C-alpha cells in the first residue's frame, strides 16, 4: 500500500 | 405518441463517447515525485472496463502538464455530436484541486473548463465524467471499528478519496478506488443507475480495504471516495 | 429466512432522527453582512417538508459562531441510538468551506467533525446529511443558451451551488435551491432514492431559474447545485 | 434575486  | 418522461440522459447516440485515460506513472526526477507502482494495473482495468461499455478508449502515458492541457484542449475541440457522453480518467499524484503532470501540476478546474457548456457545444447537455485517482491532501482516515443551462451543469467528478485526504494505491493490485470502480461497473453497468454504482464503490472501498504499513503513521488507515455530482439527469450506460 | 440484500440504509428505527435548521437572517452590524431576505420562507418550507418526513425538526435563528459550534457539539453528544439518520440544514452567508454565524465564520469541516464515525458512535453507520444554502465564492455562472469503516463515511453534503460560486436567494420566494429541494422532497420522497431526488433538484435549479438584476454584472446568471456524497448505501426516506 |  502506497499513497498518491 | 403516448406519455413521455425525460429523467435520464440520452445514451443511444451512435457512439457512447471518448474515454480518455491519463496514466502518469513516472515523473521527472526534478519534481521529486515517486513512481506510482500499480497504476498500469489500473490503466489496463479501466481500458477493458470502458471498452465493454462501448467507449472509444484512448490511453495516454506519462504526460507533462503541457501535454495534459493540450490534450484536453484538443479533445474538447473535436466534434462530439454523435457521442452520448465524455469520460476522462486521471491517474496521478495530486493535491486538493490539482493533479500532476510528469513535470508539475495542473489545475483540475482548468481541465474541466474546456468542456464547459459554452466552450464545448457538442457536449452541451451531455454527461461529462471525470474520474480521479490522486491524493487530495495529506490527511489519513483512522477509521472506527464497527432558455439557458449553467455552464457548469452536467459534470460529475468521481473522486477516489475525501477532500483533504491521501488516496491509497496498492503496488501489486492497483488503487483501491479504481479496482473497486471497475468491479462495480462490470457487475452493475447493465443494471444500476450510475450514482447507485458509485455508491456501491463507496461501500466497497470503505469496507474491504485497510492499509498495512511498517510505519505506524500510515498503518491501519481507511478511505472513503467522494461523489461530486452536478448532473441533471439519471445516467444509465445501457439503453432500451 | 430467504436471501437478503443490504444495499440501503436501515430507515425503520423508531425515529427518523433530528433535523436541525440553522436560519441566519440578521448579522451583527460590525460584520457588514446584509440581511438575508427570504430565508424565513426557506426555513418554514424546510420545517414543514421534514416534518412530513417524520423528522424531529428543531429551528434555530440568528446564531453566533459560538452558538453554532456549541449546538453541533451538544447535538452530537445526544443519544441517537433510536434514530435512523441525522440532518442539518445551514442557511447563511458563506464562502468556500465556510458558513457564517451572525458574528463571524464557522468552518464547515469543524461542524461535520462532531458527527464523525468515531466521535458520534450512535450515528456510526447511519446517514449524516448536511444541506447548505450559502455562497461558496464569488463566481457567477453565465449559462449557455440551449473491521473498521472510515470516520468520514456516511456523510452527504448537498450544496446549493458549485464550488467557487455565488448562491442565489430570492427575497420573496426563498432560495432557488431550498425552494426546489422541498418541492422535490414533497413530490418524490415516497418514490425515489435520495441521490435521484437531489438530481431532480439539480435539474430544477439549472433549468427553471435565472437571475434578474439592474446590474449587468449580476443579471441573467444561472446556478447548478452540487451533490457531495460519501454515503455507502442507498437512502430512501420511506421503509417497507 | 440576491446572492448569499
Question: What are the φ and ψ backbone dihedral angles of B9, each rounded to 5 degrees?
Answer: -60, 145
Grid cell listed for B65: 502538464
Q: For B230, which residue in chain C has the nearest alpha carbon?
A: C226
Sheet containing C104-107: which strands, arranged edge to edge?
C94-95, C98-101, C104-107
CA distances to B212, B213, B226 from A1, in Å: 6, 7, 20
Give the separation between CA C64 and CA C59, rounded to whole angstroms.
15
- B93 part of the active site: yes
Q: Testing the interface with B: which of C153, C187, C197 to mutate, by most B Cβ within 10 A?
A: C153
Question: What are the φ and ψ backbone dihedral angles of B162, each rounded to 5 degrees?
Answer: -65, 150
Strands (E), chain B: 15-23, 56-61, 83-91, 94-95, 98-101, 104-107, 128-133, 144-145, 148-149, 155-159, 168-170, 174-175, 226-229
CB contact, 8 Å: B187 with chain A? no
SS3 label, residue B67: helix
Cα angle for residues B164, B169, B172 (degrees, 5° grid): 175
- Placement of cell 444561472 in the chain: C222
SS3 label, residue C70: helix
Contacts 24+ apart (CB under 8 A), B208-215: B208/B180, B209/B168, B209/B176, B209/B180, B210/B143, B210/C147, B210/C148, B211/A1, B211/B168, B212/A1, B213/A1
Cβ neighbours for B79, distance < 8 A, ≥ 6 positions apart: B122
Q: Does residue B154 contact residue B126 with C-beta atoms inside 8 Å?
A: yes
Grid cell listed for C90: 445551514
What does this entry list as its resolution, in Å? 2.0
Maximum separation of any 2 CA atoms in chain C, in Å:
66
CA distances to B13, C194, C196 from B196, in Å: 23, 10, 9
Strands (E), chain C: 15-23, 56-61, 83-91, 94-95, 98-101, 104-107, 128-133, 144-145, 148-149, 155-159, 168-170, 174-175, 226-229
Q: Under an 8 A CB cutoff, do D2 and C212 touch? A: no
Give the separation between CA C77 and CA C120, rounded to whole angstroms.
7
CA distances to B36, B122, C54 from C36, in Å: 49, 39, 28
* H helix or E strand, kind and range, residue B177: helix B176-188
Give the separation between CA C123 and CA C82, rounded to whole angstroms.
10
Half-sphere exposure of D2 (CA within 13 A, CB side): 15
Q: Quick count: other Cβ atoms within 10 Å of Cβ D2?
A: 17
Question: What are the φ and ψ backbone dihedral angles of B206, each rounded to 5 degrees?
Answer: -65, -35
* H helix or E strand, kind and range, residue D3: strand D2-3
Segment 107-166 of chain B within 8 Å of chain A by CB: 133-135, 160, 166
Q: Under an 8 A CB cutoff, do C170 and D4 touch? A: no
Cβ neighbours for B191, distance < 8 A, ≥ 6 positions apart: none
Give the separation between CA C41 and CA C177, rounded to whole angstroms.
12
CATH number belonging to the domain at B1-240, selected among 3.40.50.620, 3.40.47.10, 3.10.310.10, 3.40.50.1460 = 3.40.50.1460
H-type alpha helices, chain C: 39-52, 65-76, 108-113, 176-188, 194-208
Task: Choose, from B19, B88, B135, B182, the residue flagged as catalytic.
Answer: B135
Q: Under an 8 A CB cutoff, do B118 and C226 touch? A: no
CA distances to B49, B51, B218, C23, C33 from B21, in Å: 12, 12, 29, 44, 45
Interface residue ranges in chain A relative to chain B, Cβ cutoff 8 Å: 1-4
- C19 part of the active site: no
Q: Does residue B37 contact residue A3 with C-beta atoms inside 8 Å?
A: no
Give the separation between CA B201 and CA C229, rounded to whole angstroms.
12
Q: Under an 8 A CB cutoff, do A3 and B175 touch? A: no
- Placement of cell 430544477 in the chain: C204
Cα angle for residues B209, B90, C116 (degrees, 5° grid): 40
Contacts 24+ apart (CB under 8 A), C139-142: C139/C164, C139/C165, C139/C166, C140/C165, C140/C166, C140/C217, C140/C218, C140/C221, C141/B150, C141/B151, C141/B152, C141/C165, C141/C221, C141/C222, C141/C223, C141/C224, C142/B118, C142/B151, C142/C220, C142/C221, C142/C222
Q: Does residue C53 contact residue C236 with C-beta atoms inside 8 Å?
A: no
Cα angle for residues C66, C67, C69 (degrees, 5° grid): 65
Give the separation between CA C86 and CA C128, rounded to whole angstroms.
5
Count, in order, helices (H) and strands (E) of chain B.
Answer: 5, 13
Chains C & D: contacts with CB separation below 8 Å: 35
Q: Does residue C133 contact residue C212 with C-beta atoms inside 8 Å?
A: no
Cβ neighbours for B51, distance < 8 A, ≥ 6 positions apart: B57
Q: For C143, which residue in chain B has the nearest alpha carbon?
A: B150
Q: Under an 8 A CB cutoff, do A4 and B213 touch? A: no
* H helix or E strand, kind and range, residue D2: strand D2-3
Give the separation between CA C201 and CA C195, rounded to whole angstroms.
10
Kindly compute the dihedral angle of the four CA atoms of residues C212, C218, C222, C225, in this order, to the nearest 10 degrees: -120
Neighbour-count burial of C226, counting CB atoms closer than 10 A to its CB (0-12 exposed, 13-18 middle, 19+ buried): buried
Distance from CA of B230 to the nearest CA of C (A): 5
Give the separation between CA B223 and CA C207, rounded to whole angstroms.
35
Which positions in chain B touch C220 (Cβ < 8 Å)? 148
Give the separation between CA C162 and CA C177, rounded to whole angstroms.
12
CB contact, 8 Å: C195 with chain B? yes
Distance from CA of C160 to the nearest CA of D (A): 10
Give the separation between CA C152 and CA C118, rounded to whole angstroms.
9
Q: Under an 8 A CB cutoff, do C145 and B143 touch? A: no
Physical contact, C and D (3 or more Cβ pairs within 8 A): yes
SS3 label, residue B131: strand
Q: For A2, which residue in chain B has the nearest alpha carbon?
A: B169
Half-sphere exposure of B166 (CA within 13 A, CB side): 20
Give the separation between CA B66 and CA C230, rounded to whole angstroms.
33
Cα angle for residues B29, B34, B40 (degrees, 5° grid): 115
Q: For A1, which residue in chain B has the nearest alpha carbon?
A: B170
Cβ neighbours for B105, distance < 8 A, ≥ 6 positions apart: B65, B95, B98, B99
Grid cell listed for C235: 437512502
Give the separation between CA C166 and CA B23, rounded to whole angstroms.
34
Nearest to B133 by CA among B215, B46, B10, B27: B46
The approach used to solve this structure was X-ray
Half-sphere exposure of B62 (CA within 13 A, CB side): 11
Q: Under an 8 A CB cutoff, do B170 and A1 touch? A: yes
Q: Does residue C24 contact residue C34 with C-beta atoms inside 8 Å?
A: no
Distance from CA of A1 to the nearest CA of B (A): 4
- Placement of cell 469543524 in the chain: C110
Task: Choose, from C19, C88, C120, C135, the residue flagged as catalytic.
Answer: C135
Cβ neighbours for C218, distance < 8 A, ≥ 6 positions apart: C140, C211, D1, D3
Q: For B221, which residue in chain C has the nearest alpha carbon?
A: C150
Q: For C169, which residue in chain D has the nearest alpha carbon?
A: D2
Neighbour-count burial of B30, counting CB atoms closer than 10 A to its CB (0-12 exposed, 13-18 middle, 19+ buried): exposed
Domain ranges of chain C: 1-240
B192-230 CB burial, b ≥16 within 10 A, e <16: bbbbbbbbbbbbbbbbebbbeeeeeebeebbbbbbbbbb
Distance from CA of A2 to the nearest CA of B (A): 5
Give the separation between CA C213 and CA B4, rounded to whole angstroms.
36
Q: Testing the interface with A: which of B164, B169, B172, B177 to mutate, by most A Cβ within 10 A?
A: B169
Grid cell listed for C196: 435521484
Q: Which chains lie within 8 Å of chain C at 3 or more CB pairs, if any?
A: B, D
CB contact, 8 Å: B15 with chain C? no
Give the separation between CA C192 and CA C49, rounded to whole angstroms.
16
* H helix or E strand, kind and range, residue A2: strand A2-3
Task: Choose, from C19, C88, C93, C182, the residue flagged as catalytic.
Answer: C93
Give the separation between CA B65 and CA B69, rounded to whole angstroms.
6
Q: Does residue C149 contact residue C194 with C-beta atoms inside 8 Å?
A: no
Give the separation between CA B30 and CA B48, rounded to whole angstroms.
33
Neighbour-count burial of B176, counting CB atoms closer than 10 A to its CB (0-12 exposed, 13-18 middle, 19+ buried): buried
Grid cell listed for C192: 425515489
For residue B59, list its beta bridge partners. Answer: B21
C22-45 CB burial, b ≥16 within 10 A, e <16: bbbbebeeeeebeebebbebbbeb
Positive/negative CA dihedral, B102, B108, B113, B116? positive
Nearest to B149 by CA among C209, C49, C15: C209
- Placement of cell 461497473 in the chain: B185
Amino acid at each position: 500500500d502506497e499513497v498518491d | 405518441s403516448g406519455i413521455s418522461l425525460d429523467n435520464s440522459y440520452k445514451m443511444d447516440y451512435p457512439e457512447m463517447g471518448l474515454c480518455i485515460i491519463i496514466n502518469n506513472k513516472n515523473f521527472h526526477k526534478s519534481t521529486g515525485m515517486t513512481s506510482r507502482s500499480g497504476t498500469d494495473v489500473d490503466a489496463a482495468n479501466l481500458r477493458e472496463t470502458f471498452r465493454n461499455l462501448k467507449y472509444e478508449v484512448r490511453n495516454k502515458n506519462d504526460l507533462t502538464r503541457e501535454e495534459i492541457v493540450e490534450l484536453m484542449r484538443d479533445v474538447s475541440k473535436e466534434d462530439h455530436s454523435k457521442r452520448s457522453s465524455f469520460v476522462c480518467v486521471l491517474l496521478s499524484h495530486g493535491e486538493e484541486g490539482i493533479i500532476f503532470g510528469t513535470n508539475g501540476p495542473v489545475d483540475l478546474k482548468k481541465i474541466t473548463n474546456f468542456f464547459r457548456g459554452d466552450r464545448c457545444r457538442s457536449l452541451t447537455g451531455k454527461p461529462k465524467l471525470f474520474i480521479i485517482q490522486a491524493c487530495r491532501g495529506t490527511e489519513l482516515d483512522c477509521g472506527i471499528e464497527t432558455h439557458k443551462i449553467p455552464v457548469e451543469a452536467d459534470f460529475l467528478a468521481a473522486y477516489s478519496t475525501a477532500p483533504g485526504y491521501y488516496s491509497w494505491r496498492n503496488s501489486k493490485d492497483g488503487s483501491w478506488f479504481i479496482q473497486s470502480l471497475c468491479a462495480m461497473l462490470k457487475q452493475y453497468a447493465d443494471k444500476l443507475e450510475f450514482m447507485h454504482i458509485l455508491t456501491r464503490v463507496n461501500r466497497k472501498v470503505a469496507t474491504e480495504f485497510e492499509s498495512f504499513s511498517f510505519d505506524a503513521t500510515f498503518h491501519a488507515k481507511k478511505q472513503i471516495p467522494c461523489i461530486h455530482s452536478m448532473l441533471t439527469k439519471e445516467l444509465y450506460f445501457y439503453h432500451h
